[PDB]
Amino acid sequence: QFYGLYVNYRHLALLCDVMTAKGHLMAITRHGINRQDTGALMRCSFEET
DNA sequence: TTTTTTTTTTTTTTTTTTTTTTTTTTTTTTTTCCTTTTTTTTTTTTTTTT
Secondary structure (H helix, E strand, O other): OOOOOOOOHHHHHHHHHHHOOOOOOOOOOOOOOOOOOOOHHHHHOOOOO
8 A cells, every 4th residue: 555556355365364374474485385284296396396 | 317508410491603505587589609638648650770
């Protein structure tokens, strides 16, 4: 809202629920995505293959 | 002669510093240059001598 851009609430609440799903702060880095419980090929496709 | 009281020695954490490691928008089009090199060993050749 500083730049006057409007994004719908669902697309923001989905991200806010993705980060707070595990009970702590799951950042969107290589330290939060690669520390999840997903598959090996999914995690190696992003960073630190 | 036993109990408290001081000393000691680990014990686990804390905190700060240092080190390490990993990352850095998407697509497309043209040229240029290099894709060895000097060193050491081996083999052949040429000249000389008896």
